[PDB]
Design a protein around this ligand. Structure first.
Ligand code: CDL
Ligand code: CDL
Ligand code: PC1
Ligand code: PC1
Ligand code: PC1
Ligand code: 3PE
Ligand code: 3PE
Ligand code: 3PE
Ligand code: 3PE
Ligand code: DGT
Lengths: 48, 62, 164, 368, 165, 95, 341, 100, 35
């Protein structure tokens, strides 16, 4: 029950929160680069 | 009779709620009426700029 | 061919359009997750392990997609019934394939239960006729007194249009 | 700084004294009332430091009455244990649990090895830090300089002095160092520091000459504790404060003369440190604009609750500074049901207050 | 033709701007890009007022801050490479001969000059740089340039506060 | 088409300046200089737009004022770290 | 944040620039107001006592000018394609406009600057950042009619903003992650109404003022710092911490009302799956709200005993206790309200 | 043109900044669109007023005229490359220098 | 009323993050005055 329940839900949410803190430990240039790619696919499709 | 009156009031409120939901759906489908679901686009600034450009034709001179 | 949808034809009618549609959704999801993957967590260096991480994060999703579609077509064409438990079998198969990439047996079934639930809910949406993300029939652009809210100092010149 | 003898009379203020204990000083008060218009040569902060038996209250009193400044006395723990209504909270000691009872410097003099002593020194810092800002509010708002018997810059000397004798653990040193690193960077360093030098034996001689009943028959003031503090002054605190404040060593082994040190203060030129902008001496008082002066006055006359809320460090790893929850509950039920502190000060009707039905005046920088 | 020459020069200066890393060298690439941008915006317009305005504001007015900061940032000199100069010259001669073998009528811009307009156009004969600049100093668009001068004073007030002087 | 032959080059050089703005192989001064490169390309594209209309080219010194105030703001942000982060913060490859 | 009158000047000019942004009838005057708002929000978010505030202002400058130039480039591209400000059939240039607005607002594909900047600020510039600086981009998002970008942003905001706040024990980053989740409820309300968004934004703003005033007066920046916070009566600390349960969306307090109006309007607009995706991903927000509420819901704690007086501001805490009353007893005013209809 | 959310005094200056109303080849077309946006509003004006929208965009955007010009120039070059048109008759009789 | 939060309970809130990993265990807490 706690597996497929509250304890394993808390463990999976703690693991998902721990693995998302590694996304936020990077420099600003990586996230701005991700925005620049999202502009880049949005302009490639404007050609097509 | 108190329950009969309260049921009549709640039933009439249900019909008016259904009817205003239908009226609001038909208003948002067409954007016809000027109360809800209407974006007021005004050309007041365009008419002001056209009146100013017509006024500066008289000012052109020496 | 590449613009084919999943539901332009009934279940069991064509295989290739369903494979292309579900696989292109898997490729889009894998590319969208892999672009946020290799720049943020476990960042690789060089051209080869970056493409290796892209394949490792995209191709298993393609395998889940084509396995779900193939066992859905097998369960549909094995009998005459077209019902939600074929989507349940397909979700169980996709969860079992995902498990193999995980290498955990528990992960594969645990995934198959949720994917079968998603499959029977989507088949309920197909049967009943509603949409997950419909267009809004009501969109309040503003509240009441929307014409009397013009607090502007500039005087309005007379308009060039009438209602007569 | 000019004394009263050479000036021939009392000093004159350059502006009206602001009622800083009654009226607040926000930015809307800082628009009209400027603060650099009332500053002169007698607007310095002087700290008279020394050993524990040197005469510093009498010397600071005659320096305040000679240089026309205000004497701020040394802090003692009667300021907490006696409220605004005059009731003593040392009479609540049988009602309080023994881990949360009163601990004044008298209890330190007989029992220095108690667990409350590591709290006690921190409490002393919370009375020096609360006094210096109350000194700074007298400097920035009225223009009159202040003189202090004790300063919060010199309170760490007593902390390591109780550490070296063994009265503090390593965790007490860690939490006091964390509190000091959290708080000491928010208050301006003094202009001038006087160290009344005494040898270790003359301190003991003045201690037995004073004949205070807890200084005598106490094992705290041994030949190691006094030597540790007089060494620790001259090689940590004086060396730290000499980068900013002027440092005056006076041989106070005799009775000490007052006119010679006023003469020594008066020959110090205070304008030569303002020539260099990046000079280390008097850096904290170098405000080039009136807006920075008003910001500095706002920081201590209006943001004193911020600097008092900077003491909110959590450190639960020490067992002798954590008040247990049942003891904290009965401490609240005893302390806050006292006649003095049932309500906020000025609003307690049990101890003779009237007109509470139409009274909505809270007060400025009042402890709740 | 000369519009295509400015296209080629802007492409070459942009790819060498992408290639180089020394900060004063990027500042020099910006100051030599601003001249070509000024001329190329002068090719579409009726008269060269806004190219002059962009010149005084951007190059002679603003980029001198960038040149000063990048000059005091870097102690070292430029490491000139003949490979990058040869590659820039090769792509420049390739793009000029590509403009030679291309029809310039289809590649010309559709924006009208002062002489590309009609002869019967009354407004073009009046005064050079008159009707375009008119809306700066007329009702009701004068509030924007009053707000711009106020914005520049407020910008100076911001800059004095953030540098801490 | 019209986009391929006209105003295609400011888009390409704008994306090149955007990629120079966000690349991890550059530094903060290179970010600011590439930022003013995309300011120049924005002026180019805005002037191509504003010259389809005849007498609305006066907006070109409004965007110029705002972007030049942006550039001076960025320089004054960047050199305000001289007294705090030292003179070696200009070579920082990451933020 | 009122140490100088120049900061009051910057506050009124950032108010003026935001009002220029949200009232512009063209896509370029909105950019003009965005630059005015940026110029007046650079000196706030910068101070001499805090070292991290200068590099946080550098992060804010690079994030906003990256977003503003893409917003300008795509608006000029829209004007080059069709010369009116509106668009008949929606295309990719509106997608670039909306993505440049989402970098300004802080939606979850582009939100990674937001808590990383929030890790080094004060509690008043944070109050300006999550409340007033969300006015200028979100009011321009309502002019576009693409659905899937808003769908992806709402879904990613409510999962990423709720999960990512669990690991954070700093109060500023936790409030930034909670504001990212409350951002997604505002964009989900923007697809169905332009008035229910104002309802949710005004009361979310109200909850932001009353909750960030608790951490600004008493100078709280940590979860462990809440346990050492000394309140003279523990009933008052228990009562003051009900704003977390209020903002989490619990029925007796206020803060259930705007979320409930969003639920009422979304179900009437036949959008059920996205509502379920948000409300299964708002329980985590109440979980890290209740992790704050560990420090007040129990009635006795192992307090540090050196501090025995509660020090506080007078005017700010006088303004605080009015808004704390309406944060938990404000559902009695639903009979007086008429702005839902 | 965009409908602003709020109608404050601060839209009075921004609104007149860009507009074809100042003398232009076809601002009289734009006025015929703009008053139409006063009649049906912004959202019904996208559907009920689509004929007047395309004329203004055709005039100032210059889309189909430039596309027709590029169709007439690429077909001439295709006829040159395919051998149908060659020599001194590749280009026609040029216009006079003051014709346009 | 018999169990109250011990310092063992507030030990888990004293880290730089709520759930430490091998990367964030070597981190330090920010200063308590946030400057
Ligand atoms: C209903 C709730 C109550 C009933 C269920 C209670 C919990 C039951 C848990 C359980 O049975 O787990 C079994 C099982 C346990 O596996 P295990 O053996 O412990 O672990 C082995 C592997 O590591 C397992 O591999 P894995 O799980 O790491 O690999 C897949 C993983 C890969 O991802 C990761 O590893 C982490 C990626 C970053 C996570 C944080 C950012 C997420 C951003 C959102 C992305 C999707 C957005 C939606 C789409 C947007 C575009 C349209 O991706 C996900 O799990 C996607 C989760 C997306 C967030 C959902 C949040 C709640 C929304 C409501 O877990 C699964 O089968 C995972 C599937 C999801 C289960 C539920 C998770 C809830 C949180
Ligand atoms: C028929 C075919 C015959 C064979 C042709 C062979 C061609 C390939 C081999 C030559 C070659 O390119 O060598 C690369 C060789 C290597 O150059 P690099 O290391 O790539 O870069 C040049 C240094 O940075 C330069 O460092 P630096 O500062 O010591 O340079 C001294 C400067 C001294 O400059 C002058 O004396 C010029 C005076 C002012 C001229 C006007 C202002 C500019 O010389 C130049 O600027 C050379 C032009 O460059 C030369 O020999 C340059 C001249 C060609
Ligand atoms: C692996 C891939 C993950 C991302 C897939 C995204 C696909 C997508 O956006 O589809 C759009 C579609 C849009 O759906 P729709 O309802 O708009 O479909 C109508 C489609 N037309 C217009 C062609 C008739 O989204 C879905 O189909 C969502 C289905 C969700 C099913 C599971 C729900 C329960 C989940 C419990 C956990
Ligand atoms: C406090 C004022 C907050 C801002 C609202 C100003 C206003 O008049 O909004 C009009 C709006 C009316 O909406 P509206 O009709 O003006 O919306 C604009 C519509 N378009 C974009 C088409 C032009 O008022 C509200 O929505 C009520 C908000 C109440 C907030 C306070 C609750 C207590
Ligand atoms: C045309 C002249 C091009 C000169 C050039 O690019 O030199 C390379 C150098 C590059 O300097 P650099 O030191 O940044 O070099 C890094 C780039 N690589 C290693 C690829 C060469 O630029 C200059 O010297 C600038 C001179 C002024 C340009 C105006
Ligand atoms: C089948 C039905 C399952 C229902 C599960 C409901 C969630 C639940 O009960 O979570 C409990 C959990 C707290 O668990 P706790 O006791 O604190 O953990 C001890 C240390 N492992 O609390 C949490 O995990 C808080 C977050 C819950 C998120 C629920 C929605 C997820 C999507
Ligand atoms: C980033 C934020 C999260 C993105 C999540 C994307 C989820 C999948 C998705 O929405 O894919 C979009 C699209 C398929 O969706 P659909 O609208 O049916 O495609 C029409 C094709 N003309 O996907 C595609 O069209 C992708 C086609 C393949 C692209 C990569 C080829 C190599
Ligand atoms: C280059 C190779 C990969 C190409 C992938 C192309 C994905 C987008 C395909 C597409 O047409 O997306 C547009 C579509 C909305 O357009 P549509 O639905 O046709 O009409 C508007 C009314 N709904 O759908 C959308 O706008 C929703 C998002 C679609 C999927 C996005 C895929 C993102 C790819 C990775 C980006 C990662 C971050 C950088
Ligand atoms: C793509 C799926 C790839 C494999 C994923 C793992 C197995 C999932 C099994 C159930 C999948 C859903 C049912 C099959 C289906 O129709 O998938 C295609 C569907 C989008 O197709 P459609 O509804 O036609 O949308 C066109 C919009 N332009 O796409 C979806 O409904 C998205 C997939 C389901 C939701 C995410 C996964 C569960 C959580
Ligand atoms: N533990 C501890 N004891 C302190 C501290 N400050 C002062 N004391 C104690 C040590 C001595 O018993 C006594 C110090 O005496 P004072 O410095 O008040 O000087 P005293 O009043 O003797 O002479 P004076 O007023 O200067 O003429 O108080 C402190 O921070 N911690």
């Amino acid at each position: 029950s706690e597996y497929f329940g509250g304890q394993h839900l808390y463990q999976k949410l703690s693991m998902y929160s721990k693995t998302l803190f590694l996304m936020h430990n990077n420099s600003l240039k990586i996230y701005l680069l991700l925005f620049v790619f999202w502009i880049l696919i949005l302009l490639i499709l404007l050609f097509l | 009779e108190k329950s009969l009156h309260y049921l009549y009031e709640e039933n009439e409120k249900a019909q008016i709620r259904l009817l205003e939901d239908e009226v609001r759906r038909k208003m948002s489908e067409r954007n016809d009426y000027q109360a809800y679901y209407y974006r007021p686009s005004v050309a007041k600034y365009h008419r002001i700029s056209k009146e100013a450009a017509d006024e500066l034709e008289a000012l052109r001179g020496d | 061919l590449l613009r084919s949808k999943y539901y332009d034809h009934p279940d069991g009618e064509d295989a290739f359009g369903k494979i292309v549609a579900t696989n292109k959704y898997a490729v889009s999801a894998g590319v969208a997750w892999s672009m946020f993957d290799v720049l943020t967590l476990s960042k690789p260096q060089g051209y080869l392990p970056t493409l290796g991480r892209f394949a490792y994060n995209t191709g298993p999703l393609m395998g889940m997609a084509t396995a779900f579609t193939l066992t859905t077509l097998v369960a549909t064409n094995a009998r005459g019934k077209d019902d939600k438990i074929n989507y349940l079998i397909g979700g169980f198969a996709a969860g079992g394939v995902f498990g193999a990439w995980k290498h955990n047996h528990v992960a594969g079934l645990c995934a198959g239960l949720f994917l079968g639930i998603a499959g029977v809910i989507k088949k309920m949406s197909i049967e009943q006729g509603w949409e997950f993300f419909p267009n809004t029939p009501i969109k309040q652009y503003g509240g009441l007194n929307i014409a009397g809210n013009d607090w502007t100092i500039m005087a309005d010149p007379p308009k060039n249009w009438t209602t007569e | 700084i000019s004394g009263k003898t050479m000036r021939g009379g009392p000093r004159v203020p350059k502006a009206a004294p602001y009622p800083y204990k009654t009226k607040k000083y926000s930015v809307f008060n800082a628009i009209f009332d400027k603060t650099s218009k009332r500053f002169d040569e007698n607007s310095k902060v002087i700290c008279v430091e020394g050993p524990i038996a040197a005469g510093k209250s009498k010397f600071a009193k005659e320096l305040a009455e000679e240089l026309d400044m205000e004497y701020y006395p040394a802090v003692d723990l009667d300021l907490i244990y006696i409220n605004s209504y005059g009731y003593d909270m040392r009479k609540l000691d049988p009602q309080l649990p023994p881990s949360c009872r009163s601990y004044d410097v008298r209890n330190f003099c007989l029992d220095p090895s108690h667990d409350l002593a590591a709290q006690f020194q921190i409490r002393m810092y919370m009375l020096r830090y609360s006094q210096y800002i109350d000194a700074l509010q007298h400097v920035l708002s009225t223009g009159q300089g202040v003189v202090l018997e004790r300063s919060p810059y010199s309170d760490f000397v007593f902390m390591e002095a109780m550490f070296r004798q063994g009265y503090l653990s390593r965790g007490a040193r860690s939490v006091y160092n964390e509190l000091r690193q959290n708080t000491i960077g928010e208050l301006l360093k003094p202009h001038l520091v006087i160290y009344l030098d005494l040898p270790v034996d003359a301190v003991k001689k003045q201690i037995k000459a004073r004949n205070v009943d807890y200084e005598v028959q106490s094992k705290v003031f041994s030949d190691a504790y006094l030597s540790d503090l007089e060494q620790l002054y001259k090689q940590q605190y004086l060396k730290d404060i000499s980068t900013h404040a002027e440092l005056l060593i006076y041989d106070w082994t005799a009775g000490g003369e007052t006119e010679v040190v006023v003469e020594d203060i008066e020959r110090i030129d205070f304008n030569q440190f303002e020539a260099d902008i990046h000079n280390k001496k008097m850096l904290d008082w170098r405000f080039p604009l009136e807006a920075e002066w008003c910001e500095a006055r706002i920081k201590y006359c209006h943001e004193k609750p911020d600097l008092m809320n900077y003491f909110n460090v959590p450190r639960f790893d020490v067992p002798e500074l954590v008040r247990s929850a049942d003891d904290g509950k009965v401490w609240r039920d005893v302390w806050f049901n006292a006649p003095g502190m049932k309500y906020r000060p000025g609003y307690n009707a049990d101890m003779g207050d009237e007109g509470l039905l139409t009274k909505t005046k809270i007060g400025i920088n009042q402890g709740i | 033709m000369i519009q295509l020459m400015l296209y080629s020069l802007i492409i070459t200066t942009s790819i060498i701007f992408l290639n180089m890393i020394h900060p004063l060298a990027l500042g020099l690439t910006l100051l030599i890009q601003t001249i070509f941008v000024c001329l190329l915006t002068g090719l579409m317009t009726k008269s060269f007022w806004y190219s002059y305005i962009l010149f005084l504001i951007f190059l002679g007015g603003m980029l001198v801050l960038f040149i000063y900061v990048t000059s005091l940032a870097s102690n070292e000199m430029f490491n000139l490479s003949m490979k990058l100069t040869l590659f820039s010259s090769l792509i420049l001669i390739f793009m000029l001969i590509l403009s030679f073998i291309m029809d310039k009528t289809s590649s010309s811009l559709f924006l009208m000059n002062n002489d590309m307009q009609s002869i019967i156009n009354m407004n073009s004969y009046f005064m050079e740089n008159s009707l375009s600049l008119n809306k700066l100093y007329n009702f009701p668009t004068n509030f924007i340039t009053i707000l711009l001068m106020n914005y520049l004073l407020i910008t100076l007030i911001v800059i004095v506060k953030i540098t801490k002087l | 088409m019209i986009m391929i032959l006209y105003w295609s080059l400011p888009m390409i050089l704008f994306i090149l300046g955007l990629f120079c703005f966000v690349s991890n192989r550059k530094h903060l001064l290179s970010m600011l200089l590439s930022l003013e490169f995309i300011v120049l390309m924005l002026f180019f594209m805005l002037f191509i737009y504003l010259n389809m209309l005849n007498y609305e080219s006066y907006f070109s010194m409004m965007f110029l004022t705002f972007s030049v105030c942006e550039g001076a703001l960025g320089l004054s942000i960047l050199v305000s770290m001289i007294r705090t982060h030292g003179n070696d913060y200009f070579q920082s490859f990451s933020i | 944040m009122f140490n100088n009158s120049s900061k009051i000047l910057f506050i009124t000019i950032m108010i003026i620039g935001t009002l220029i942004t949200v009232t512009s009838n063209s896509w370029l005057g909105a950019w003009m107001g965005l630059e005015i708002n940026l110029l007046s929000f650079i000196p706030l978010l910068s101070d001499n006592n805090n070292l991290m505030s200068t590099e946080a202002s550098l992060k804010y400058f690079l994030t906003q000018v990256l977003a503003s130039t893409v917003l300008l480039f795509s608006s000029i591209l829209l004007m080059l394609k069709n010369n009116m400000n509106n668009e008949i059939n929606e295309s990719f240039t509106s997608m670039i406009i909306m993505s440049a607005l989402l970098l300004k607002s802080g939606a979850a594909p582009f939100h990674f600057w937001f808590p990383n900047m929030m890790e080094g600020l004060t509690w008043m510039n944070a109050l300006m950042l999550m409340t007033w600086q969300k006015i200028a981009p979100l009011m321009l998002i309502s002019y576009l009619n693409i659905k899937y970008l808003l769908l992806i942003s709402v879904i990613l905001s409510v999962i990423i903003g709720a999960i990512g706040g669990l690991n954070q024990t700093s109060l500023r980053k936790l409030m930034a992650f909670s504001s990212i989740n409350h951002l997604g409820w505002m964009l989900s309300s923007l697809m169905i109404s332009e008035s229910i968004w104002l309802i949710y934004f005004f009361f979310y703003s109200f909850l932001s003022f009353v909750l960030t005033f608790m951490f600004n007066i008493f100078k709280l920046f940590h979860l462990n710092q809440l346990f050492s916070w000394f309140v003279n009566s523990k009933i008052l600390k228990f009562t003051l911490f009900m704003n977390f349960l209020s903002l989490g969306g619990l029925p007796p307090f206020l803060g259930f009302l705007p979320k409930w109006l969003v639920i009422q309007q979304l179900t009437l607009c036949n959008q059920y799956f996205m509502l379920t995706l948000m409300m299964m991903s708002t329980l985590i927000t109440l979980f890290f709200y209740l992790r704050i509420c560990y420090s007040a819901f129990m009635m006795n704690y192992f307090e540090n005993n050196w501090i025995m007086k509660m020090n506080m501001n007078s005017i700010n805490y006088n303004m605080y206790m009015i808004m704390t009353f309406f944060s938990i007893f404000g559902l009695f005013l639903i009979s007086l309200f008429y702005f839902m209809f | 043109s965009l409908t602003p959310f709020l109608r404050l005094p601060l839209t009075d200056l921004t609104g007149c900044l860009i507009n074809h109303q100042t003398y232009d080849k076809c601002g009289k077309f734009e006025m015929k669109m703009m008053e139409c946006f006063e009649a049906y509003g912004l959202e019904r004006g996208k559907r009920e007023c689509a004929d007047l929208i395309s004329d203004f965009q055709e005039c100032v955007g210059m889309q189909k005229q430039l596309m027709r010009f590029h169709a007439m120039r690429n077909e001439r070059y295709k006829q040159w490359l395919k051998g149908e048109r060659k020599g001194q008759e590749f280009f026609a009789d040029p216009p006079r220098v003051d014709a346009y | 009323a018999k169990w109250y939060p011990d310092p063992e309970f507030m030990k888990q809130f004293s880290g730089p993050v709520m759930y430490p990993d091998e990367v964030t265990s070597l981190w330090t807490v920010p200063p308590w005055n946030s400057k």
